[PDB]
Amino acid sequence: ALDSFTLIMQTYNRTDLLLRLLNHYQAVPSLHKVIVVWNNVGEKGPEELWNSLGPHPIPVIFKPQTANKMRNRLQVFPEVETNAVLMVDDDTLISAQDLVFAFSIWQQFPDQIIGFVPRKHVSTSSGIYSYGGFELQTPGPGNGDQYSMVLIGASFFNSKYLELFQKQPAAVHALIDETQNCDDIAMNFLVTRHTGKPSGIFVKPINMVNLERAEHFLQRSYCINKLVNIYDGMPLKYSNIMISQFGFPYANHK
Amino acid sequence: SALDSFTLIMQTYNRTDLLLRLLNHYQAVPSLHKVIVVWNNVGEKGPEELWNSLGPHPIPVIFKPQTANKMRNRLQVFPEVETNAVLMVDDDTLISAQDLVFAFSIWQQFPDQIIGFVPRKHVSTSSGIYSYGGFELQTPGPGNGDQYSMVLIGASFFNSKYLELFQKQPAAVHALIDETQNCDDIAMNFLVTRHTGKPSGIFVKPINMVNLEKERAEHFLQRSYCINKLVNIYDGMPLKYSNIMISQFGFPYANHK
């Protein structure tokens, strides 16, 4: 469990993708264990099929969930024995090279969210925020762009943040269940409030692939504003730091 | 205010025209508090009169005549440096304002490290002996990508507190620099990493940096020689490897994709 990380993957109606991803992730260096957050209420977990195809490099724990809740992967699983957690959605295949490098970045910034998907909030009307990415104008000072969030569905973060999450105001948990969304927006609010630094650091992926609701994006902005009310303040901080691996690919420094 | 700013320290020798050209550029960079020109042309008269004639300029430029032409003259503690950050650049290097503005903001977040555009490293093929080089040499670290253990000071941002700390180094270090008239940057990197326990620097990939040199064989060998010399003086190899390369998110546009 030393200098290792635990992979937490929540799954819902993507069992065939789960097994495909698990086949890849199990072979990544520094992986200590895998916890599958089975959100398919009332369905048998592929653990049987999985074992039959063993042996496997690391332990894979299937934890059947009572309800299909987005926040289930944010609980404090006693089985997590590592300081760091790797959280990936069950439709994303991140290369081992990206994970190895990103994990080494997390070790140097264990209190921030190190991930591959950067996003931000903007404001054109005093106190009213909107959620978005690079299609929206930069908020920050001058040139370039900025991000104030790193989505948790493809990141490394401190396992202590799962406990800390549980201790957030009831209105926050209520909001998450209400929308069954915004869990990562919540995690970013929480982290930056705890550190006073940008909630995360963006690590540009070399090989990350997605294998595969109109108001889904609408809830995004809605949540930011709700969280600002609940917390009585916008804590998110902008950053334009983009980290890549020196020399990987070869000669990428020039 | 001197606080959200940095001081440019440029040492010059036999490049007065190159100096003046660079000055015209650097004087207009945002957050520049002042410029200190370390005049290493022993006996020659400075261009200060010419500078003032073409005034007014955005910031004060102080030309400081030097006793002898020593590489370490730019590492002195100049009383006129009022900032916490120093921007050190060779008088043959032109760095865009964009790079400077971004690099400075990175320095602000890592004030105890050398933020620069030129990454280099040491390698060891025979136990105890080190060699100097760049990306043309194999990687020392485990095995993926490359590594850098130094960020040359000739194009970087670093705490002014280090120029004072450099004066307090073992005479041997000062002697070494004076002996070869080289390795000042290698010494600074040794110093800084010994002080922080972290990699001496962070590499920021430049978007627009150009060498205007055009406008010795032992130089290279001296470098490797200095790493081993310094290792003896410090009874050890303090330099730490890093593979962090920082670029500006969204600059160029969509460079995150």
Ligand SMILES: CC(=O)N[C@H]1[C@@H](OP(=O)(O)OP(=O)(O)OC[C@H]2O[C@@H](n3ccc(=O)[nH]c3=O)[C@H](O)[C@@H]2O)O[C@H](CO)[C@@H](O)[C@@H]1O
């Ligand atoms: C592109 C983007 O903005 N990414 C975010 C978006 O992903 P996105 O909109 O792509 O959401 P997905 O459908 O892929 O689901 C994300 C995760 O939630 C699980 N799931 C999904 C639906 C469901 O009813 N039950 C369930 O458990 C999935 O199995 C997966 O592990 O929303 C998720 C929740 O904020 C975040 O993790 C992603 O970082």
Ligand SMILES: CC(=O)N[C@H]1[C@@H](OP(=O)(O)OP(=O)(O)OC[C@H]2O[C@@H](n3ccc(=O)[nH]c3=O)[C@H](O)[C@@H]2O)O[C@H](CO)[C@@H](O)[C@@H]1O
């Ligand atoms: C790519 C590389 O390895 N870069 C290093 C190399 O640059 P490099 O070999 O290019 O050295 P330069 O000739 O450009 O000189 C660097 C600076 O020193 C001054 N100078 C030079 C010669 C002299 O007799 N007197 C004098 O004061 C120049 O005016 C200039 O400001 O060595 C310099 C000194 O160790 C370092 O700053 C650089 O980080």
Ligand SMILES: [Mn+2]
């Ligand atoms: Mn998805």
Ligand SMILES: [Mn+2]
């Ligand atoms: Mn040069």
